[PDB]
Amino acid sequence: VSGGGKKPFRQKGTGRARAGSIRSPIWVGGGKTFAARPQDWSQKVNRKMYRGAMQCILAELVRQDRLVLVEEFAVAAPKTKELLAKLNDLNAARALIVTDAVDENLYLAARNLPHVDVVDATAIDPVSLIAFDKVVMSVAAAKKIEVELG
């Protein structure tokens, strides 16, 4: 805190409580007692523990029927309405789509849709696997995930 170098008044004789600096944390406008600094909030996750959690999540999605397998998933143009109609006939209006590779038209069509996202098979994460209502996964992406073993 700015200033505060000198002793505000003499130690004895004034009748005041003793003070050493006007920037004492007791005083209004003084320093914070335990000032914070930038922190790193990352934790270590064991490789096996991460893989096991992903396997558990996928199995639970299969059990709860929130995972929908499709032979092929592609769009002919980067138009939002076409993807919306496809998702509606799949009855997957709110969904995370997982593909072997993200086609540019699919990405552009899905960009503006709320509650809809599109990801590569190698980019799934545990939070996104749980947050979305349903996961629409192509067979190629499913086999790549199988090779990765969760």
Asked if 140 interacts with RNA (CB under 7 A), we say no
Query: What mask of x and - would describe binding to RNA in positions 29 to 48, judged by CB under 7 A?
Result: xx-xxxxxxxx--x-xxxxx
Between 69 and 101, name the residue whose CB sits nearer to RNA.
101
Task: Determine the Cα–Cα distance for residues 94 and 131; give it in Å rounded to an integer.
Answer: 10
Q: Which residues are paired to 97 by β-bridges?
A: 118, 136
Q: Which of 69, 101, 125, 143 binds RNA (CB under 7 A)?
A: 125
Asked if 147 interacts with RNA (CB under 7 A), we say no
Task: Determine the Cα–Cα distance for residues 60 and 94; give it in Å rounded to an integer.
Answer: 19
Helix, strand, or coil (residue 51): helix
Nearest to 99, CA basis, from 82, 114, 81, 83: 83
Between 61 and 80, name the residue whose CB sits nearer to RNA.
80
Helix, strand, or coil (residue 101): coil
Between 43 and 71, name the residue whose CB sits nearer to RNA.
43
Of the candidate spans 63-71, 123-131, 139-147, the one that interacts with RNA by CB under 7 A turns out to be 123-131
The kind and range of the H/E element at 142 are helix 139-148
Asked if 63 interacts with RNA (CB under 7 A), we say no
Which residues make Cβ contacts (< 8 Å) with residue 79, sequence separation at least 6? 109
Could you list the residues that contact RNA (CB under 7 A)? Answer: 1-6, 12-22, 25-30, 32-39, 42, 44-52, 78-81, 84, 108-109, 111-115, 122-123, 125, 131, 148
